[PDB]
Design an enzyme around this catalytic site. Structure first.
Site, mmCIF file in Angstrom:
data_model
loop_
_atom_site.group_PDB
_atom_site.id
_atom_site.type_symbol
_atom_site.label_atom_id
_atom_site.label_comp_id
_atom_site.label_asym_id
_atom_site.label_seq_id
_atom_site.Cartn_x
_atom_site.Cartn_y
_atom_site.Cartn_z
ATOM 1 N N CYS A 37 0.777 -1.243 0.000
ATOM 2 C CA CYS A 37 0.000 0.000 0.000
ATOM 3 C C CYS A 37 0.829 1.327 0.000
ATOM 4 O O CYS A 37 0.366 2.365 -0.481
ATOM 5 C CB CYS A 37 -0.981 -0.061 1.199
ATOM 6 S SG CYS A 37 -1.384 1.472 2.088
ATOM 7 N N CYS A 54 8.180 0.786 4.454
ATOM 8 C CA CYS A 54 7.883 1.711 3.360
ATOM 9 C C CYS A 54 8.089 3.178 3.750
ATOM 10 O O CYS A 54 8.521 3.975 2.911
ATOM 11 C CB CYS A 54 6.466 1.486 2.816
ATOM 12 S SG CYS A 54 5.127 1.591 4.033
ATOM 13 N N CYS A 114 0.631 -11.424 2.524
ATOM 14 C CA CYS A 114 0.548 -10.770 3.832
ATOM 15 C C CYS A 114 1.310 -11.490 4.970
ATOM 16 O O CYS A 114 1.395 -10.977 6.083
ATOM 17 C CB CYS A 114 -0.936 -10.705 4.272
ATOM 18 S SG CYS A 114 -1.663 -12.270 4.899
ATOM 19 N N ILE A 136 12.247 15.485 11.128
ATOM 20 C CA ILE A 136 11.651 14.159 10.958
ATOM 21 C C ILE A 136 11.901 13.312 12.196
ATOM 22 O O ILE A 136 13.053 13.169 12.641
ATOM 23 C CB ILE A 136 12.295 13.461 9.760
ATOM 24 C CG1 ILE A 136 12.135 14.342 8.521
ATOM 25 C CG2 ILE A 136 11.705 12.078 9.550
ATOM 26 C CD1 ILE A 136 10.754 14.935 8.348
ATOM 27 N N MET A 137 10.814 12.763 12.750
ATOM 28 C CA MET A 137 10.899 11.780 13.826
ATOM 29 C C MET A 137 10.483 10.420 13.282
ATOM 30 O O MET A 137 11.337 9.576 13.084
ATOM 31 C CB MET A 137 10.064 12.198 15.039
ATOM 32 C CG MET A 137 10.565 13.448 15.772
ATOM 33 S SD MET A 137 12.297 13.478 16.302
ATOM 34 C CE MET A 137 12.432 12.064 17.415
ATOM 35 N N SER A 184 4.032 11.435 8.938
ATOM 36 C CA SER A 184 3.275 12.572 8.405
ATOM 37 C C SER A 184 3.923 13.119 7.155
ATOM 38 O O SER A 184 3.258 13.316 6.159
ATOM 39 C CB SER A 184 3.157 13.702 9.400
ATOM 40 O OG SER A 184 3.210 14.933 8.693
ATOM 41 N N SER A 232 5.843 9.976 16.503
ATOM 42 C CA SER A 232 6.200 10.704 17.724
ATOM 43 C C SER A 232 5.063 11.602 18.162
ATOM 44 O O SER A 232 4.186 11.949 17.357
ATOM 45 C CB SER A 232 7.413 11.613 17.443
ATOM 46 O OG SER A 232 7.030 12.949 17.112
ATOM 47 N N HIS A 280 2.947 14.361 15.984
ATOM 48 C CA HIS A 280 1.492 14.371 15.981
ATOM 49 C C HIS A 280 0.927 15.769 16.189
ATOM 50 O O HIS A 280 0.089 16.239 15.412
ATOM 51 C CB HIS A 280 0.953 13.481 17.091
ATOM 52 C CG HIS A 280 -0.506 13.195 16.948
ATOM 53 N ND1 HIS A 280 -0.985 12.016 16.419
ATOM 54 C CD2 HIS A 280 -1.592 13.958 17.213
ATOM 55 C CE1 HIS A 280 -2.305 12.055 16.388
ATOM 56 N NE2 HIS A 280 -2.699 13.222 16.867
ATOM 57 N N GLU A 336 -15.561 -19.205 -4.612
ATOM 58 C CA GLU A 336 -16.333 -17.957 -4.745
ATOM 59 C C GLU A 336 -17.623 -17.908 -3.953
ATOM 60 O O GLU A 336 -18.140 -16.790 -3.712
ATOM 61 C CB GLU A 336 -16.539 -17.512 -6.198
ATOM 62 C CG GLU A 336 -16.493 -18.604 -7.244
ATOM 63 C CD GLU A 336 -16.742 -18.053 -8.622
ATOM 64 O OE1 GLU A 336 -16.686 -18.834 -9.597
ATOM 65 O OE2 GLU A 336 -16.995 -16.834 -8.711
#
Ligand SMILES: Cc1cc2nc3c(=O)[nH]c(=O)nc-3n(C[C@H](O)[C@H](O)[C@H](O)COP(=O)(O)OP(=O)(O)OC[C@H]3O[C@@H](n4cnc5c(N)ncnc54)[C@H](O)[C@@H]3O)c2cc1C
Ligand SMILES: Nc1nc2c(c(=O)[nH]1)N[C@H]1C(S)=C(S)[C@@H](COP(=O)(O)O)O[C@H]1N2
Ligand SMILES: Nc1nc2c(c(=O)[nH]1)N[C@H]1C(S)=C(S)[C@@H](COP(=O)(O)O)O[C@H]1N2
Ligand code: MOS
Ligand code: MOS
Ligand code: FES
Ligand code: FES
Lengths: 1288, 99, 50, 50
Positions: A41, A71, A114, A231-232, A236, A320, A324, A1222
């Protein structure tokens, strides 16, 4: 200058002159060749890229282990740390770790994509809690999604770690040795034990990255580069550079600064470091809550509440607290709570210390209340609550966790000793505008008043116009958001008017008896049982045994190679697409000049560059686009990075075209082909019925959401224009055709090879082939291997989904609920292209379990300006059968009978005839319904739910039961043909292949079970590599629920041929090994290679007359589901589900039960939480609360029972088995009708009779607004055409 | 087939065999290589007989294939191999054969 | 069934690419498997003749 | 355009194998010293009969 030094799986890793923009996930996969860690994703939502991070605290002398999503991690953050991937904890060529062993052997892997993420979440938690509780394990997996398994088998694997006829032997799983775990690399301890003050610097041409390792230095860098982000966690900043076009030339990324990670237990409260993770904050506050008395822990309870649901475990451990707060996301779950709680921020600059309050202005980013550009957030003070101070936080999302809030809130009241006069009041909301906003003006007007209903009615009014949304608000859902705002206000009134009652019983009133249930909410535990059968057969015959998927362990260890896991082939290029951004527009111009000049770019193809090979049976848009997401350009470059950079610089100028058709109703304004079924005479029947009823139901689409995105590698050989195509598809023969056609080559020049697919569910056929064709054209043109892999956002947009449906019906029925007459209309939404197949199967399977003596059924597919929809697991049945159940529950309503009484008296008898004049024996349909009523204890639980609903006004329960007749069969005999190829080598070992594709349904496992039975040898002696047009030609699609049935018959056919040839040799030496038999066969010139072939099940349909024998057999089942809804928030909880299923003789009941659960949860999602949000311009919305959510662990029903009805012989099918796979999808609507029942019980008690049609998906929005009350009436509304909405 | 092309032209000769036996041009037949995955237990490419022997086995597969198709060929004698192959698929006739 | 040998063409052999070829392949495959790496072995003319 | 075995493209991270061959026609192997060879650039492994 500096060097990046960290560890991965115990081995030292060094990069000199490292690019700071390098993320960990591509680094692991491409530079270290560890492909176990998967891309699902790219926003941190799915958890497929989960890894462990270990760090030595040099002052505390402790190693901390936390999970994280690779990622989002930039490798420059890993300096001095130790990463562990799935490969690191064990493998098949060392020792397998118990977590890996058990998740596999409990059948917790299907497609397997997964599995590595699940393994690393479970591993990491067991490293922190060696003797855990199930609570902790299922909390760890809150971040981990799965589209195949239904989670149940992964939950069973977890239970085997918890000190609390099965499908697996738990008593044989090797025990978790906590002392023989992976040793934290000693070098990193030695580096940590010597605090270097030197701040590290990493550069590239595009970016400068500074990691200050002292506080002095951090402030020094924050001064020089005031506009650089600090950057932590990168949870975000990361996601917004990925898909919001943001870029930062300078980054500051401090290491563990002690002052940023402080935990002070003050006299007035506590001060928490800005660099603490949200997970660590959840732990600190959990301890404080238990160590302190419960009126100084008021703020800390509201924070714990919202931290329990916030994202999952990986993001909480990365994110962090300072990040936030400074991010100031409008949907932030913690900021609205901090806002109301008198919290202050400890700022620090090079100039000095400084403190500001965390208020609305700050959350609105007014520069007066903001941080000044040259300073950083050190810590936040959250004070203790005073006595007579109360705090409450609420939220509603699309599902219960790992989902962004539609609306949330924090609210505080202060009374000050005794008397119920409100002295202070703060009410903050999120999801209701650009930022977290506090209703201060409303709060001013309420000071002085008592706590009672006089003040609620006015409070609701005066917040509803202060915190208003325009009907055209971003996020959509305006009337639901309006309602939640005041509904949370109500819940707060109740909650705090009870702690008052508790504390001061004589002076305050008790809550109304039917109101209490509104306060405690719906929060799970996960139980399950499984009945199935298992003398006369040999113990060495594997047919009927729950054999583990052959790749199950390889899934668990990350050794399973999926398409993109294939190593980089020499000089390969990457292909990425420019897609249409308009739904129906003219393409005036395309400018490629900027894009073409950029680094790495080799070629950019429009439709001109494909000329006469731009369409098959068109690929790239010519002069108009007919939906968003349609392919327009193809950008070919030396790397994926370079491809996407260049793609974003392609300039396309558009001119919108009318009409822009989006709905099914708009699509009804030349000639569409009809389909029709007619049984009896419906026009005569409409005169002898007691009552007549009209209605309709819309049903939404559905993303396939396979965890492996579209992925392929096309490799030209360099001889005779030979291409090899490695692609994740369900239909290799079709790939071979479209690629050969595109290259103007014969089919013998192009070969398609497929080992495994990480899920497909129908959505890796037509669209896959187009991309392969375009990809192969580029490869051939430039004499290069070309790889094309889609990111999740592009994938959902470019690929289609399930067809949305519109059902209209006129039903004539008797007063006992029997339906003698039924006129029916189906409408599929086809998208830009045709789909008719789906209408045909819809109509044939529409009957489901019921005998409609007179029936007219008609269907039409309807082209719109949306992405072109595709076939999906079920093939029109989940849509078609929902139309008929909606029609039943409406008739049930008009007769005052439960839908389950109306179902049971309209059912087929033991012997009966379908609308298409096929005879059926529906004995097992009756039994499936009987046993499910018995097993579930339906009748007793029915009165329990009626009892509950009589005693609860704001929370209702519901129960439903639906039956299943799922017919199986394809259009012709030729469509069902299937082939195999079997070799026996001179050592006696066997290699088998066949035309079927393994997508996680275990087809290859079943074929080896067949081979093992037929040649009377152990499965260890048989081996299979994959599927290939080179070995087995002309194979049909891996679809229609019959891949195993049909390829099983063809594999059996080759085996028998081989056994016939050998019978002379076997009779002459009956005690000899296969090695001996194979050798003497060679010595006697007997051939040990054999094609197997099955011609196909006989099948036909005359569509003019509406009669035929299309289906070979029918799978029968039934399912019961119970839910509880929150009428104030529209939330719900699945309490219990019971499923009985006629499967014939299961060839592998582990695999077959896996398919039932998986299909059920997939259907459950289709009908409840899965929802596709399109703008009035036809743009898909994919951000914030518009995010698409598949079912998670928290959505899986608390109880789950599954029975396999005992067998009864089908000489026609492979070992009397019935192809499920199915089917189970439609059984998900048991949950839909359970919720429908619960809503009706709220609507009857409150007195709103008449028309209730709830549409699919039954989202929290739809639930809430159906439970009308004073709050639904109160909300301000708009005129239809006065505004342009965010959605619909 | 199990024979190895070392420059003696064995693969050229097998396509000549296929071309005669199925009565189609050599341009319509293609061969990639030799592999234990496709043809198992093959003997050494030696003894001056690689073409002789693998030629007989290729001929054997072709004839098998032609026998299966003879119904389709007699019913449409002027049709292309594309037409014959397609109707064979449509009538559930197998188009793969070991020789 | 775990080991497959693929050969498109040989640039002459005349009998001298059988037993000795296989020994080198066996040794080569042992190394490949041991280290989880593709391994290429090509002889220079002088070594080859010897 | 004909691909012979060594013409195949370099596969990701492949290694190369080369042999030390006997320099005597009939002799006892008293000793093998690999310590210098093993320390040199690029070398991954050296296998004897052991
Ligand atoms: C998959 C996913 C699910 C989520 N779900 C939820 C949810 O359910 N509810 C919810 O409320 N939120 C949710 N979030 C939001 C998440 O909680 C925030 O992104 C996170 O708290 C930001 O912290 P960070 O360290 O990652 O910030 P970063 O991304 O590291 O930084 C963001 C900003 O903060 C600045 N910054 C960081 N620390 C400091 C400091 N000490 N001083 C000055 N500036 C600083 C940076 O310069 C940057 O501008 C979710 C996020 C993701 C990715
Ligand atoms: N894990 C998994 N199960 C799956 C699928 C998949 O992609 N992954 N596809 C489904 C679909 S669309 C079909 S049509 C059937 C076909 O395979 P079968 O005939 O062996 O059941 O598998 C179903 N079950
Ligand atoms: N160009 C070429 N011709 C060749 C060889 C070769 O390696 N290259 N090998 C020879 C050897 S040893 C044998 S045994 C035969 C085997 O092939 P045939 O049986 O097709 O003649 O080919 C002969 N002709
Ligand atoms: O049967 Mo769905 O895979 S076409
Ligand atoms: O016949 Mo020589 O190739 S063994
Ligand atoms: S979890 Fe990183 S890919 Fe979704
Ligand atoms: S096995 Fe979890 S995604 Fe298919």
């Amino acid at each position: 200058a500096s060097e990046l030094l960290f560890y991965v799986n115990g081995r030292k890793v060094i990069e000199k002159n490292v690019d700071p923009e390098t993320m960990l996930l591509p680094y692991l996969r491409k530079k270290l060749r560890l492909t176990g860690t998967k891309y699902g994703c790219g926003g941190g939502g799915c958890g497929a890229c989960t890894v462990m991070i270990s760090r030595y605290n040099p002052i505390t002398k402790r190693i901390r282990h936390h999970p994280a999503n690779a990622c989002l991690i930039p490798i420059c953050s890993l300096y001095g740390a130790a990463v562990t991937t799935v490969e690191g904890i064990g493998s098949t060529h060392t020792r397998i770790h118990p977590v890996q062993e058990r998740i596999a052997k409990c059948h917790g892997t299907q497609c397997g994509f997964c599995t590595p993420g699940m393994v690393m979440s479970i591993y990491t938690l067991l490293r922190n809690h060696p003797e855990p509780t199930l609570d902790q394990l299922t909390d760890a997996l809150g971040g981990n999604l799965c589209r195949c398994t239904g989670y149940r088998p992964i939950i069973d694997a977890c239970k085997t770690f918890c000190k609390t006829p099965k499908l697996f032997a738990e008593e044989e799983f090797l025990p978790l040795d906590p002392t023989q775990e992976l040793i934290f690399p000693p070098e990193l301890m030695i580096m940590a034990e010597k605090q270097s003050q030197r701040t590290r610097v990493f550069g590239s041409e595009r970016m400068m990255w500074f990691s200050p390792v002292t506080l002095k230095e951090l402030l020094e860098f924050k001064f020089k580069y005031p506009q650089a982000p600090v950057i932590m966690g990168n949870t975000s900043v990361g996601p917004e550079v990925k898909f919001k076009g943001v870029f930062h030339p300078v980054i500051i990324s401090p290491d563990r600064i002690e002052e940023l990670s402080v935990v002070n237990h003050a006299y007035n409260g506590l001060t928490l470091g800005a660099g603490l993770s949200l997970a660590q904050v959840k732990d600190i506050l959990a301890d404080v809550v238990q160590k302190l008395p419960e009126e100084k822990t008021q703020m800390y309870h509201a924070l714990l509440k919202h931290l329990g649901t916030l994202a999952g475990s990986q993001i909480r451990n990365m994110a962090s607290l300072g990040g936030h707060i400074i991010s100031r996301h409008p949907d932030s779950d913690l900021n609205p709570i901090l806002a109301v709680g008198n919290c202050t921020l400890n700022l620090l600059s090079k100039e000095g210390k400084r403190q500001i309050p965390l208020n609305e202005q700050f959350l609105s980013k007014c520069p007066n209340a903001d941080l000044k550009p040259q300073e950083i957030l050190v810590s936040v003070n959250i004070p203790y609550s005073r006595k007579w101070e109360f705090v409450s936080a609420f939220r509603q999302a699309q599902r219960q966790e790992n989902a962004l809030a539609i609306v949330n809130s924090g609210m505080r009241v202060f009374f000050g000793e005794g008397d119920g006069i409100i002295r202070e009041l703060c009410i903050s909301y999120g999801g209701v505008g650009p930022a977290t906003i506090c209703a201060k003006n409303s709060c001013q007007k309420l000071i002085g008043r008592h706590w009672n209903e006089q003040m609620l009615d006015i409070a609701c009014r005066l917040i509803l116009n202060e915190v208003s949304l325009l009907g055209s608000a971003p996020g959509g859902k305006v009337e639901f958001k309006r309602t939640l705002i005041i509904s949370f206000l109500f819940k707060f009134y109740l909650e705090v008017s009870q702690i008052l009652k508790k504390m001061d019983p004589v002076h305050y009133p008790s809550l109304a008896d039917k109101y209490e249930s509104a306060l405690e909410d719906l929060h799970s535990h996960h139980c399950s049982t499984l009945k199935y059968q298992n003398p006369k057969q040999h113990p060495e015959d594997p047919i009927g045994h729950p054999i583990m998927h052959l790749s199950g362990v390889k899934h668990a260890t990350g050794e399973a190679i999926y398409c993109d896991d294939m190593p980089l082939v020499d000089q390969e290029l990457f292909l990425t697409f420019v897609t249409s951004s308009r739904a129906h527009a003219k393409i005036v111009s395309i400018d490629l000049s900027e894009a073409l000049s950029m680094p790495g770019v080799v070629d950019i193809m429009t439709a001109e560059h494909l000329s006469d090979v731009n369409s098959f049976c068109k690929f790239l848009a010519t002069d108009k686009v007919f939906c968003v997401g349609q392919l327009v350009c193809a950008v070919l470059a030396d790397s994926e990075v370079q491809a996407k950079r260049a793609a974003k610089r392609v300039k396309i100028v558009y001119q919108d075209l009318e009409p822009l058709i989006l709905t099914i109703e708009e699509s009804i304004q030349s000639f569409k082909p009809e389909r029709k079924l007619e049984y009896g005479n419906v026009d005569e029947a409409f005169k002898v019925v007691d009552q007549i009823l009209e209605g309709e139901i819309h049903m939404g689409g559905q993303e396939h959401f396979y965890m492996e995105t579209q992925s392929m590698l096309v490799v030209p050989k360099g001889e005779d224009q030979e291409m090899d195509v490695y692609v994740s598809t369900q239909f290799p023969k079709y790939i071979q055709d479209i690629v050969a056609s595109t290259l103007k080559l014969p089919a013998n020049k192009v070969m398609c090879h497929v080992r495994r697919v990480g899920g497909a569910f129908g959505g890796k056929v037509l669209k896959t082939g187009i991309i392969a064709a375009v990809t192969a054209f580029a490869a051939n043109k430039h004499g290069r291997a070309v790889r094309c892999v889609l990111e999740r956002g592009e994938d959902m947009l470019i690929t289609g989904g399930r067809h949305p449906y519109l059902g209209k019906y006129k039903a004539g029925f008797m007063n006992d609920g029997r339906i003698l007459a039924l006129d029916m209309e189906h409408y599929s939404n086809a998208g830009a292209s045709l789909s008719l197949f789906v209408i045909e199967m819809g109509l044939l399977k529409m009957d489901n379990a019921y005998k409609f003596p007179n029936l007219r059924c008609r269907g039409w597919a309807c082209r719109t300006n949306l992405p072109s929809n595709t076939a999906f697991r079920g093939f029109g049945f989940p849509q078609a059968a929902l139309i008929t159940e909606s029609c039943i529950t409406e008739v049930a309503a008009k007769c005052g009978l439960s839908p389950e009484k109306v179902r049971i008296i309209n059912m087929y008898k033991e012997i009966d005839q379908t609308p298409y004049k096929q005879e059926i024996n529906a004995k097992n349909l009756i039994q499936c319904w009987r046993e499910c009523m018995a097993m579930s204890s339906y009748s007793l639980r029915k009165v329990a739910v009626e009892k509950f609903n009589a005693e609860n006004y704001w929370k209702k329960k519901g129960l439903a039961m639906v039956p299943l007749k799922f017919p199986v069969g394809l259009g012709s005999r030729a469509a069902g043909q299937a082939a195999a190829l079997v070799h026996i080598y001179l050592d006696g070992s066997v290699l088998v292949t066949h035309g079927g594709i393994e997508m996680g349904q275990g087809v290859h496992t079943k074929m080896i079970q067949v081979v093992s039975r037929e040649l009377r040898m152990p499965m260890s002696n048989v081996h299979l590599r994959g599927t290939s047009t080179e070995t087995v030609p002309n194979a049909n699609i891996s679809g229609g629920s019959v891949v195993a049935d049909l390829n099983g018959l063809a594999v059996k056919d080759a085996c028998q041929t081989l056994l016939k040839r050998l019978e002379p040799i076997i009779s002459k030496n009956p005690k000899g090994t296969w090695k001996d038999w194979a050798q003497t066969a060679f010595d006697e010139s007997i051939n040990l290679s054999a094609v197997g072939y099955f011609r196909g099940y006989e099948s036909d349909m005359n569509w003019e007359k509406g009669e035929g024998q299309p289906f070979e057999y029918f799978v029968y089942g039934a399912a019961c589901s119970e839910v509880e809804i929150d009428c104030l928030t529209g939330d719900h909880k699945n309490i219990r589900t019971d499923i009985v299923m006629d499967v014939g003789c299961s060839i592998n009941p582990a695999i077959d039960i896996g398919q039932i659960e998986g299909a059920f949860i997939q259907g459950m999602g289709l009908y409840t939480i899965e929802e596709l949000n399109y703008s009035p311009q036809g743009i898909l919305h994919t951000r914030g609360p518009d995010q698409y959510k598949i079912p998670a662990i928290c959505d899986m029903p608390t109880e789950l029972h599954i029975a396999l009805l005992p067998p009864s012989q089908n000489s026609n099918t492979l070992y009397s088995s019935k192809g499920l796979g199915e089917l189970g999808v439609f059984l998900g609507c048991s949950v839909f009708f359970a919720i429908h029942d619960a809503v009706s019980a709220a609507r009857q008690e409150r007195g709103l009779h008449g028309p209730l049609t709830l549409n699919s998906p039954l989202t929290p929005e739809k639930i809430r607004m159906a439970c009308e009350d004073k709050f639904t009436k109160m909300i301000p509304r708009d005129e239809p055409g006065s505004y342009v909405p965010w959605n619909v």
